Symmetry: C5
Subunit: 104 residues, 5 copies
Protein backbone atom coordinates (compact mmCIF):
# COMPACT_ATOMS: atom_id res chain seq x y z
CA UNK A 1 0.00 0.00 0.00
CA UNK A 2 2.70 2.48 1.20
CA UNK A 3 5.92 2.16 -0.55
CA UNK A 4 9.53 2.99 0.35
CA UNK A 5 12.97 2.52 -1.32
CA UNK A 6 15.02 -0.61 -0.57
CA UNK A 7 18.59 -1.48 -1.52
CA UNK A 8 21.57 -3.59 -0.60
CA UNK A 9 25.09 -4.42 -1.69
CA UNK A 10 26.62 -7.89 -1.81
CA UNK A 11 30.36 -8.55 -2.25
CA UNK A 12 32.83 -11.47 -1.64
CA UNK A 13 33.65 -10.11 1.84
CA UNK A 14 30.06 -9.37 2.74
CA UNK A 15 27.95 -11.96 0.90
CA UNK A 16 24.65 -11.75 2.75
CA UNK A 17 22.04 -9.28 3.43
CA UNK A 18 19.36 -10.09 5.99
CA UNK A 19 15.95 -8.51 5.47
CA UNK A 20 13.76 -8.60 8.55
CA UNK A 21 11.17 -6.43 10.09
CA UNK A 22 9.90 -5.74 13.67
CA UNK A 23 6.08 -6.65 14.03
CA UNK A 24 3.69 -3.61 13.96
CA UNK A 25 2.05 -6.36 6.78
CA UNK A 26 5.32 -6.08 4.78
CA UNK A 27 6.66 -7.23 1.46
CA UNK A 28 10.06 -6.75 -0.16
CA UNK A 29 9.46 -6.13 -3.88
CA UNK A 30 12.71 -6.80 -5.81
CA UNK A 31 13.21 -4.67 -8.97
CA UNK A 32 16.75 -4.87 -10.25
CA UNK A 33 19.99 -6.78 -9.71
CA UNK A 34 23.10 -5.06 -11.15
CA UNK A 35 26.85 -5.39 -11.31
CA UNK A 36 29.19 -2.57 -10.24
CA UNK A 37 32.00 -1.45 -12.54
CA UNK A 38 34.72 -3.40 -10.78
CA UNK A 39 32.91 -6.64 -10.61
CA UNK A 40 35.15 -9.30 -12.26
CA UNK A 41 34.18 -10.64 -15.61
CA UNK A 42 32.57 -13.83 -14.56
CA UNK A 43 29.03 -15.09 -13.75
CA UNK A 44 27.55 -13.87 -10.48
CA UNK A 45 24.64 -15.72 -9.00
CA UNK A 46 22.43 -14.10 -6.36
CA UNK A 47 20.10 -16.17 -4.29
CA UNK A 48 17.23 -15.59 -1.98
CA UNK A 49 16.49 -17.62 1.11
CA UNK A 50 13.04 -17.70 2.60
CA UNK A 51 9.87 -19.77 3.45
CA UNK A 52 8.02 -21.90 0.94
CA UNK A 53 4.35 -22.62 1.09
CA UNK A 54 4.93 -25.61 3.44
CA UNK A 55 6.77 -23.25 5.88
CA UNK A 56 10.26 -24.56 5.17
CA UNK A 57 13.13 -22.37 4.26
CA UNK A 58 14.36 -22.68 0.72
CA UNK A 59 17.28 -21.18 -1.36
CA UNK A 60 16.33 -20.06 -4.87
CA UNK A 61 18.51 -18.37 -7.53
CA UNK A 62 17.11 -14.91 -8.41
CA UNK A 63 19.60 -13.99 -11.16
CA UNK A 64 22.85 -14.88 -12.88
CA UNK A 65 24.70 -11.99 -14.31
CA UNK A 66 27.99 -11.27 -16.11
CA UNK A 67 29.45 -7.86 -16.88
CA UNK A 68 30.32 -8.52 -20.48
CA UNK A 69 26.98 -10.25 -21.26
CA UNK A 70 24.25 -8.96 -19.04
CA UNK A 71 25.09 -6.44 -16.22
CA UNK A 72 21.53 -5.70 -15.11
CA UNK A 73 18.57 -7.90 -14.64
CA UNK A 74 15.22 -6.47 -13.92
CA UNK A 75 12.85 -8.65 -11.78
CA UNK A 76 9.74 -6.48 -12.35
CA UNK A 77 8.60 -6.48 -8.75
CA UNK A 78 9.13 -9.94 -7.34
CA UNK A 79 7.44 -9.82 -4.01
CA UNK A 80 8.80 -11.77 -1.02
CA UNK A 81 7.57 -11.88 2.55
CA UNK A 82 10.20 -11.22 5.19
CA UNK A 83 12.31 -12.71 6.71
CA UNK A 84 14.55 -13.06 3.66
CA UNK A 85 18.31 -13.29 3.13
CA UNK A 86 19.93 -12.29 -0.15
CA UNK A 87 23.20 -14.13 -0.82
CA UNK A 88 25.99 -13.87 -3.33
CA UNK A 89 26.90 -17.45 -4.55
CA UNK A 90 29.56 -16.66 -7.02
CA UNK A 91 31.62 -13.87 -8.45
CA UNK A 92 33.51 -11.00 -6.75
CA UNK A 93 30.88 -8.35 -6.81
CA UNK A 94 29.94 -5.86 -6.00
CA UNK A 95 26.28 -6.74 -6.81
CA UNK A 96 23.54 -4.36 -6.05
CA UNK A 97 19.88 -5.12 -5.39
CA UNK A 98 17.13 -2.48 -5.61
CA UNK A 99 13.50 -2.49 -4.94
CA UNK A 100 10.58 -1.43 -2.73
CA UNK A 101 9.65 -2.25 0.85
CA UNK A 102 5.90 -2.29 0.91
CA UNK A 103 3.81 -1.76 4.08
CA UNK A 104 0.05 -2.39 4.35
Amino acid sequence: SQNFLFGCELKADKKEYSFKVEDDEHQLSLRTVSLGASAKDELHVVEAEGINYEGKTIKIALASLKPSVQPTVSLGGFEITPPVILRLKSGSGPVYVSGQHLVA
Copy 2:
Protein backbone atom coordinates in the same frame (compact mmCIF):
# COMPACT_ATOMS: atom_id res chain seq x y z
CA UNK B 1 -3.90 -13.56 -1.14
CA UNK B 2 -0.60 -14.85 0.36
CA UNK B 3 2.71 -15.29 -1.19
CA UNK B 4 5.48 -17.84 -0.56
CA UNK B 5 8.86 -18.37 -2.26
CA UNK B 6 9.17 -21.01 -4.93
CA UNK B 7 12.23 -22.51 -6.62
CA UNK B 8 13.52 -25.63 -8.31
CA UNK B 9 16.69 -26.83 -9.89
CA UNK B 10 16.80 -28.69 -13.15
CA UNK B 11 19.80 -30.52 -14.44
CA UNK B 12 21.24 -33.54 -16.28
CA UNK B 13 20.16 -36.22 -13.78
CA UNK B 14 17.24 -34.38 -12.65
CA UNK B 15 15.39 -32.89 -15.63
CA UNK B 16 11.89 -32.51 -14.23
CA UNK B 17 10.14 -30.81 -11.41
CA UNK B 18 6.53 -31.63 -10.73
CA UNK B 19 4.52 -28.85 -9.18
CA UNK B 20 1.40 -30.28 -7.64
CA UNK B 21 -0.90 -29.12 -4.90
CA UNK B 22 -3.39 -31.09 -2.67
CA UNK B 23 -6.98 -29.78 -2.39
CA UNK B 24 -7.09 -27.57 0.71
CA UNK B 25 -9.15 -24.54 1.49
CA UNK B 26 -7.43 -22.45 -1.28
CA UNK B 27 -6.95 -21.42 -4.98
CA UNK B 28 -3.30 -21.84 -5.93
CA UNK B 29 -1.20 -20.34 -8.66
CA UNK B 30 2.49 -20.68 -9.38
CA UNK B 31 3.93 -17.30 -10.46
CA UNK B 32 7.27 -17.72 -12.41
CA UNK B 33 9.67 -14.86 -11.96
CA UNK B 34 13.08 -15.93 -13.31
CA UNK B 35 14.95 -18.59 -15.14
CA UNK B 36 18.72 -18.58 -14.61
CA UNK B 37 21.79 -20.69 -15.47
CA UNK B 38 24.22 -21.62 -12.85
CA UNK B 39 27.87 -20.87 -13.08
CA UNK B 40 28.89 -24.53 -13.83
CA UNK B 41 26.51 -24.72 -16.82
CA UNK B 42 28.15 -25.61 -20.12
CA UNK B 43 28.26 -22.80 -22.77
CA UNK B 44 25.44 -24.19 -24.91
CA UNK B 45 21.70 -23.70 -25.41
CA UNK B 46 19.50 -24.47 -22.48
CA UNK B 47 15.69 -24.74 -23.20
CA UNK B 48 13.19 -24.87 -20.28
CA UNK B 49 9.66 -26.00 -20.93
CA UNK B 50 6.35 -26.19 -19.08
CA UNK B 51 3.94 -29.06 -19.39
CA UNK B 52 0.30 -28.66 -18.40
CA UNK B 53 -3.22 -28.33 -19.81
CA UNK B 54 -4.55 -25.99 -22.41
CA UNK B 55 -8.09 -24.53 -22.21
CA UNK B 56 -9.56 -27.81 -23.79
CA UNK B 57 -7.87 -30.19 -21.36
CA UNK B 58 -5.12 -31.26 -23.68
CA UNK B 59 -1.66 -31.67 -22.31
CA UNK B 60 0.72 -29.35 -24.01
CA UNK B 61 4.38 -28.50 -23.75
CA UNK B 62 5.31 -24.81 -24.11
CA UNK B 63 8.76 -23.26 -24.32
CA UNK B 64 9.48 -20.91 -21.40
CA UNK B 65 13.02 -19.78 -22.28
CA UNK B 66 16.06 -20.36 -24.44
CA UNK B 67 19.22 -19.38 -22.43
CA UNK B 68 23.05 -19.69 -22.86
CA UNK B 69 25.88 -18.62 -20.50
CA UNK B 70 27.60 -16.28 -22.94
CA UNK B 71 24.59 -14.64 -24.51
CA UNK B 72 21.75 -14.56 -21.95
CA UNK B 73 22.19 -16.44 -18.67
CA UNK B 74 18.94 -15.17 -17.13
CA UNK B 75 15.45 -14.27 -18.25
CA UNK B 76 12.87 -12.58 -16.08
CA UNK B 77 9.38 -13.80 -16.80
CA UNK B 78 7.60 -11.05 -14.82
CA UNK B 79 5.05 -13.24 -13.14
CA UNK B 80 4.03 -15.93 -15.50
CA UNK B 81 1.14 -17.49 -13.59
CA UNK B 82 0.38 -21.22 -14.03
CA UNK B 83 -2.44 -23.26 -12.48
CA UNK B 84 -1.07 -26.53 -10.91
CA UNK B 85 -0.37 -29.29 -11.92
CA UNK B 86 2.63 -28.31 -14.04
CA UNK B 87 5.90 -30.04 -14.84
CA UNK B 88 8.94 -27.81 -15.56
CA UNK B 89 11.49 -29.65 -17.70
CA UNK B 90 15.03 -29.04 -18.91
CA UNK B 91 14.42 -30.01 -22.53
CA UNK B 92 17.91 -29.25 -23.60
CA UNK B 93 21.31 -28.58 -21.90
CA UNK B 94 23.36 -29.84 -18.93
CA UNK B 95 22.19 -27.26 -16.41
CA UNK B 96 22.08 -26.54 -13.56
CA UNK B 97 19.08 -24.21 -14.40
CA UNK B 98 17.22 -22.54 -11.58
CA UNK B 99 13.63 -21.40 -11.81
CA UNK B 100 12.33 -19.02 -9.16
CA UNK B 101 8.89 -17.67 -8.43
CA UNK B 102 6.06 -17.44 -5.97
CA UNK B 103 3.47 -19.85 -4.72
CA UNK B 104 0.38 -17.72 -4.43
CA UNK B 105 -2.50 -18.84 -2.13
CA UNK B 106 -6.06 -17.25 -2.04
CA UNK B 107 -9.49 -18.14 -0.66
Copy 3:
Protein backbone atom coordinates in the same frame (compact mmCIF):
# COMPACT_ATOMS: atom_id res chain seq x y z
CA UNK C 1 -11.09 -16.42 -14.14
CA UNK C 2 -9.52 -19.76 -15.21
CA UNK C 3 -5.92 -19.71 -16.32
CA UNK C 4 -4.41 -22.24 -18.85
CA UNK C 5 -1.13 -22.65 -20.65
CA UNK C 6 -0.74 -21.23 -24.19
CA UNK C 7 1.98 -22.01 -26.69
CA UNK C 8 2.72 -22.15 -30.34
CA UNK C 9 5.65 -22.89 -32.56
CA UNK C 10 6.14 -20.74 -35.66
CA UNK C 11 8.38 -22.30 -38.44
CA UNK C 12 9.30 -22.07 -42.20
CA UNK C 13 6.72 -24.67 -43.00
CA UNK C 14 4.11 -23.19 -40.68
CA UNK C 15 4.59 -19.46 -40.39
CA UNK C 16 1.16 -18.58 -38.89
CA UNK C 17 -0.70 -19.60 -35.86
CA UNK C 18 -4.32 -18.61 -35.65
CA UNK C 19 -5.71 -18.08 -32.23
CA UNK C 20 -9.49 -18.48 -32.38
CA UNK C 21 -11.83 -19.87 -29.75
CA UNK C 22 -15.27 -21.53 -30.20
CA UNK C 23 -18.28 -19.22 -29.59
CA UNK C 24 -19.04 -19.13 -25.92
CA UNK C 25 -20.35 -16.73 -23.28
CA UNK C 26 -17.01 -16.55 -21.62
CA UNK C 27 -14.54 -13.87 -22.29
CA UNK C 28 -11.23 -15.22 -23.60
CA UNK C 29 -7.84 -13.58 -23.46
CA UNK C 30 -4.31 -14.52 -24.33
CA UNK C 31 -1.54 -13.08 -22.13
CA UNK C 32 1.79 -13.43 -24.06
CA UNK C 33 4.77 -14.11 -21.81
CA UNK C 34 7.80 -15.20 -23.84
CA UNK C 35 9.12 -15.57 -27.25
CA UNK C 36 12.19 -17.76 -27.73
CA UNK C 37 14.38 -19.27 -30.45
CA UNK C 38 14.57 -23.03 -31.04
CA UNK C 39 17.83 -24.77 -31.18
CA UNK C 40 18.00 -25.01 -34.87
CA UNK C 41 17.24 -21.30 -35.65
CA UNK C 42 19.64 -19.67 -38.02
CA UNK C 43 21.81 -16.95 -36.45
CA UNK C 44 19.94 -14.06 -37.85
CA UNK C 45 17.10 -11.68 -36.88
CA UNK C 46 13.71 -13.31 -36.39
CA UNK C 47 10.61 -11.23 -36.10
CA UNK C 48 7.28 -12.27 -34.76
CA UNK C 49 4.23 -10.21 -35.42
CA UNK C 50 0.59 -10.22 -34.44
CA UNK C 51 -2.37 -9.47 -36.64
CA UNK C 52 -5.76 -8.49 -35.28
CA UNK C 53 -8.12 -5.55 -35.07
CA UNK C 54 -7.35 -2.09 -33.76
CA UNK C 55 -9.86 0.15 -31.86
CA UNK C 56 -11.23 1.58 -35.08
CA UNK C 57 -12.13 -1.99 -36.24
CA UNK C 58 -9.35 -2.23 -38.77
CA UNK C 59 -7.03 -5.21 -39.23
CA UNK C 60 -3.38 -4.21 -38.41
CA UNK C 61 -0.02 -6.01 -38.12
CA UNK C 62 2.24 -5.23 -35.10
CA UNK C 63 5.80 -6.46 -34.50
CA UNK C 64 6.01 -8.22 -31.18
CA UNK C 65 9.65 -9.09 -30.95
CA UNK C 66 12.89 -9.32 -32.75
CA UNK C 67 15.36 -12.04 -31.60
CA UNK C 68 18.63 -13.59 -32.66
CA UNK C 69 20.35 -16.60 -31.26
CA UNK C 70 23.72 -15.02 -30.55
CA UNK C 71 22.35 -11.70 -29.28
CA UNK C 72 18.98 -12.22 -27.60
CA UNK C 73 17.39 -15.71 -28.00
CA UNK C 74 14.46 -15.07 -25.54
CA UNK C 75 12.26 -11.91 -25.04
CA UNK C 76 9.80 -11.66 -22.12
CA UNK C 77 6.69 -9.70 -23.08
CA UNK C 78 5.43 -9.45 -19.45
CA UNK C 79 1.78 -10.20 -20.16
CA UNK C 80 0.87 -8.66 -23.46
CA UNK C 81 -2.85 -9.11 -23.28
CA UNK C 82 -4.63 -9.75 -26.60
CA UNK C 83 -8.30 -10.25 -27.42
CA UNK C 84 -8.92 -13.20 -29.89
CA UNK C 85 -9.08 -13.39 -32.90
CA UNK C 86 -5.38 -12.98 -33.45
CA UNK C 87 -2.84 -14.47 -35.83
CA UNK C 88 0.75 -14.79 -34.72
CA UNK C 89 3.20 -14.90 -37.71
CA UNK C 90 6.88 -15.40 -38.23
CA UNK C 91 7.48 -12.32 -40.41
CA UNK C 92 11.15 -13.00 -40.99
CA UNK C 93 13.78 -15.45 -40.00
CA UNK C 94 13.90 -19.19 -40.42
CA UNK C 95 12.67 -20.13 -36.98
CA UNK C 96 11.61 -22.13 -35.23
CA UNK C 97 10.27 -19.50 -32.83
CA UNK C 98 8.19 -20.38 -29.78
CA UNK C 99 5.58 -18.17 -28.19
CA UNK C 100 4.42 -18.96 -24.62
CA UNK C 101 1.83 -17.48 -22.38
CA UNK C 102 -1.49 -17.83 -20.62
CA UNK C 103 -5.02 -18.36 -21.97
CA UNK C 104 -7.45 -16.76 -19.51
CA UNK C 105 -11.22 -17.51 -19.53
CA UNK C 106 -13.55 -15.46 -17.38
CA UNK C 107 -17.16 -16.05 -16.57
CA UNK C 108 -20.00 -13.99 -17.87
Copy 4:
Protein backbone atom coordinates in the same frame (compact mmCIF):
# COMPACT_ATOMS: atom_id res chain seq x y z
CA UNK D 1 -13.01 -2.39 -20.43
CA UNK D 2 -12.00 -3.06 -24.08
CA UNK D 3 -8.54 -4.12 -25.31
CA UNK D 4 -7.31 -3.65 -28.85
CA UNK D 5 -4.01 -4.17 -30.62
CA UNK D 6 -1.76 -1.13 -31.04
CA UNK D 7 1.34 -0.68 -33.15
CA UNK D 8 3.38 1.56 -35.36
CA UNK D 9 6.35 1.49 -37.61
CA UNK D 10 8.94 4.31 -37.43
CA UNK D 11 11.59 4.72 -40.14
CA UNK D 12 13.84 7.17 -42.02
CA UNK D 13 10.98 8.12 -44.36
CA UNK D 14 8.34 8.12 -41.67
CA UNK D 15 9.90 9.22 -38.46
CA UNK D 16 6.76 10.08 -36.48
CA UNK D 17 3.55 8.38 -35.31
CA UNK D 18 0.93 10.69 -33.84
CA UNK D 19 -1.61 9.02 -31.54
CA UNK D 20 -4.76 10.83 -30.71
CA UNK D 21 -8.27 9.92 -29.73
CA UNK D 22 -11.56 11.89 -29.78
CA UNK D 23 -14.04 10.49 -27.22
CA UNK D 24 -16.35 12.38 -24.91
CA UNK D 25 -17.67 9.23 -23.04
CA UNK D 26 -14.81 6.67 -22.50
CA UNK D 27 -11.26 7.10 -21.32
CA UNK D 28 -8.47 5.74 -23.53
CA UNK D 29 -4.93 4.60 -22.52
CA UNK D 30 -2.06 3.42 -24.80
CA UNK D 31 -0.16 0.65 -22.92
CA UNK D 32 3.20 0.18 -24.62
CA UNK D 33 4.64 -3.34 -24.56
CA UNK D 34 7.65 -3.63 -26.87
CA UNK D 35 10.05 -1.68 -29.01
CA UNK D 36 11.86 -3.80 -31.64
CA UNK D 37 14.14 -3.38 -34.63
CA UNK D 38 13.16 -4.63 -38.07
CA UNK D 39 15.38 -7.15 -39.86
CA UNK D 40 16.98 -4.67 -42.30
CA UNK D 41 17.83 -2.03 -39.65
CA UNK D 42 21.45 -0.83 -39.76
CA UNK D 43 23.60 -2.14 -36.97
CA UNK D 44 23.71 1.14 -35.05
CA UNK D 45 22.04 2.64 -31.93
CA UNK D 46 18.38 3.57 -32.47
CA UNK D 47 16.56 5.95 -30.13
CA UNK D 48 12.78 6.06 -29.86
CA UNK D 49 11.14 8.99 -28.14
CA UNK D 50 7.63 10.00 -26.98
CA UNK D 51 6.29 13.49 -26.81
CA UNK D 52 3.43 14.30 -24.52
CA UNK D 53 2.29 16.54 -21.70
CA UNK D 54 3.66 16.43 -18.14
CA UNK D 55 1.82 16.98 -14.92
CA UNK D 56 2.30 20.82 -15.11
CA UNK D 57 0.84 20.90 -18.69
CA UNK D 58 4.24 21.42 -20.41
CA UNK D 59 4.74 19.27 -23.57
CA UNK D 60 8.00 17.13 -22.97
CA UNK D 61 10.08 14.58 -24.90
CA UNK D 62 11.19 11.42 -23.05
CA UNK D 63 13.45 8.64 -24.36
CA UNK D 64 11.57 5.36 -24.45
CA UNK D 65 14.37 3.04 -25.61
CA UNK D 66 17.86 2.70 -27.13
CA UNK D 67 18.34 -0.45 -29.18
CA UNK D 68 20.90 -1.87 -31.51
CA UNK D 69 20.56 -4.92 -33.68
CA UNK D 70 23.76 -6.77 -32.63
CA UNK D 71 23.29 -5.91 -28.87
CA UNK D 72 19.61 -5.59 -27.87
CA UNK D 73 17.17 -5.70 -30.82
CA UNK D 74 14.11 -5.76 -28.47
CA UNK D 75 13.11 -3.80 -25.48
CA UNK D 76 10.04 -4.81 -23.47
CA UNK D 77 8.35 -1.95 -21.64
CA UNK D 78 6.00 -3.85 -19.37
CA UNK D 79 2.87 -1.80 -20.06
CA UNK D 80 4.06 1.76 -20.03
CA UNK D 81 0.69 3.46 -19.90
CA UNK D 82 0.26 6.82 -21.74
CA UNK D 83 -2.80 9.16 -21.98
CA UNK D 84 -3.31 10.45 -25.53
CA UNK D 85 -2.31 12.44 -27.30
CA UNK D 86 1.22 11.26 -27.74
CA UNK D 87 3.81 11.38 -30.55
CA UNK D 88 6.20 8.58 -31.00
CA UNK D 89 9.35 9.42 -32.88
CA UNK D 90 12.50 7.82 -34.22
CA UNK D 91 15.10 10.26 -32.97
CA UNK D 92 18.12 8.54 -34.39
CA UNK D 93 19.04 5.41 -36.36
CA UNK D 94 17.90 4.02 -39.78
CA UNK D 95 15.02 2.01 -38.64
CA UNK D 96 12.70 0.53 -39.18
CA UNK D 97 11.66 0.35 -35.51
CA UNK D 98 8.28 -1.04 -34.29
CA UNK D 99 6.34 -0.09 -31.22
CA UNK D 100 3.63 -2.52 -30.08
CA UNK D 101 1.06 -2.49 -27.28
CA UNK D 102 -2.53 -2.24 -26.30
CA UNK D 103 -5.17 0.47 -26.85
CA UNK D 104 -7.43 0.27 -23.85
CA UNK D 105 -10.82 1.82 -23.62
CA UNK D 106 -12.78 2.11 -20.31
Copy 5:
Protein backbone atom coordinates in the same frame (compact mmCIF):
# COMPACT_ATOMS: atom_id res chain seq x y z
CA UNK E 1 -6.17 8.70 -10.81
CA UNK E 2 -4.48 10.78 -13.52
CA UNK E 3 -1.41 9.74 -15.55
CA UNK E 4 1.14 12.03 -17.17
CA UNK E 5 4.50 11.52 -18.93
CA UNK E 6 7.65 11.80 -16.99
CA UNK E 7 11.26 11.99 -17.99
CA UNK E 8 14.58 13.40 -17.25
CA UNK E 9 18.11 13.45 -18.58
CA UNK E 10 21.15 12.81 -16.44
CA UNK E 11 24.71 13.71 -17.49
CA UNK E 12 28.26 14.18 -16.17
CA UNK E 13 27.39 17.79 -16.24
CA UNK E 14 24.11 17.95 -14.32
CA UNK E 15 24.25 14.65 -12.45
CA UNK E 16 20.84 15.02 -10.69
CA UNK E 17 17.15 15.17 -11.12
CA UNK E 18 15.05 16.08 -8.08
CA UNK E 19 11.54 14.64 -7.63
CA UNK E 20 6.67 16.87 -2.67
CA UNK E 21 4.22 19.17 -4.45
CA UNK E 22 2.27 21.15 -2.03
CA UNK E 23 -0.87 19.55 -2.89
CA UNK E 24 -4.06 17.93 -1.66
CA UNK E 25 -3.16 14.82 -3.80
CA UNK E 26 -0.80 11.82 -3.57
CA UNK E 27 2.03 11.72 -6.19
CA UNK E 28 3.99 8.69 -7.43
CA UNK E 29 6.68 8.37 -10.18
CA UNK E 30 6.51 5.00 -11.93
CA UNK E 31 9.91 4.47 -13.63
CA UNK E 32 9.85 2.55 -16.88
CA UNK E 33 13.18 2.67 -18.80
CA UNK E 34 16.66 3.85 -18.27
CA UNK E 35 18.57 4.32 -21.51
CA UNK E 36 21.91 5.59 -22.84
CA UNK E 37 21.82 8.35 -25.39
CA UNK E 38 23.61 8.34 -28.75
CA UNK E 39 26.78 10.13 -27.75
CA UNK E 40 27.28 8.25 -24.49
CA UNK E 41 30.75 6.73 -24.29
CA UNK E 42 31.15 2.96 -24.36
CA UNK E 43 31.60 2.37 -20.64
CA UNK E 44 29.56 1.37 -17.56
CA UNK E 45 27.03 3.88 -16.35
CA UNK E 46 25.30 3.49 -13.05
CA UNK E 47 22.04 5.28 -12.12
CA UNK E 48 21.03 5.54 -8.47
CA UNK E 49 17.99 6.78 -6.65
CA UNK E 50 18.03 8.53 -3.31
CA UNK E 51 15.05 8.62 -0.90
CA UNK E 52 13.77 7.34 2.46
CA UNK E 53 13.42 3.76 3.56
CA UNK E 54 10.35 2.80 5.61
CA UNK E 55 12.09 4.15 8.77
CA UNK E 56 12.49 7.55 7.12
CA UNK E 57 16.33 7.20 6.78
CA UNK E 58 17.69 8.53 3.51
CA UNK E 59 19.20 5.70 1.46
CA UNK E 60 20.73 5.45 -2.03
CA UNK E 61 19.88 2.42 -4.24
CA UNK E 62 21.38 1.32 -7.57
CA UNK E 63 18.63 1.32 -10.29
CA UNK E 64 20.62 0.12 -13.34
CA UNK E 65 24.00 -0.54 -14.84
CA UNK E 66 24.15 0.00 -18.57
CA UNK E 67 26.73 0.14 -21.29
CA UNK E 68 26.23 0.92 -25.02
CA UNK E 69 27.86 -2.18 -26.44
CA UNK E 70 26.27 -4.59 -23.89
CA UNK E 71 22.82 -3.29 -22.65
CA UNK E 72 21.95 0.17 -23.68
CA UNK E 73 18.44 0.12 -22.11
CA UNK E 74 17.06 -1.27 -18.94
CA UNK E 75 13.45 -1.70 -18.45
CA UNK E 76 12.34 -1.34 -14.77
CA UNK E 77 8.74 -2.44 -15.33
CA UNK E 78 7.00 0.40 -13.38
CA UNK E 79 9.22 0.93 -10.18
CA UNK E 80 6.89 3.23 -8.29
CA UNK E 81 8.60 5.74 -6.06
CA UNK E 82 6.94 8.24 -3.65
CA UNK E 83 8.57 11.77 -3.79
CA UNK E 84 11.06 13.34 -2.74
CA UNK E 85 13.56 11.25 -4.64
CA UNK E 86 16.72 12.23 -6.32
CA UNK E 87 17.87 10.34 -9.37
CA UNK E 88 21.58 10.50 -10.05
CA UNK E 89 24.22 9.33 -12.42
CA UNK E 90 26.67 7.84 -10.04
CA UNK E 91 29.11 7.03 -12.94
CA UNK E 92 29.71 7.37 -16.66
CA UNK E 93 29.42 10.40 -19.12
CA UNK E 94 25.79 10.16 -20.11
CA UNK E 95 23.57 11.33 -21.30
CA UNK E 96 21.33 8.81 -19.55
CA UNK E 97 17.56 9.16 -19.88
CA UNK E 98 14.92 7.92 -17.43
CA UNK E 99 11.40 7.61 -18.55
CA UNK E 100 8.15 6.80 -16.64
CA UNK E 101 4.81 7.95 -15.40
CA UNK E 102 3.80 10.76 -13.03
CA UNK E 103 0.61 9.52 -11.50
CA UNK E 104 -1.73 11.67 -9.32
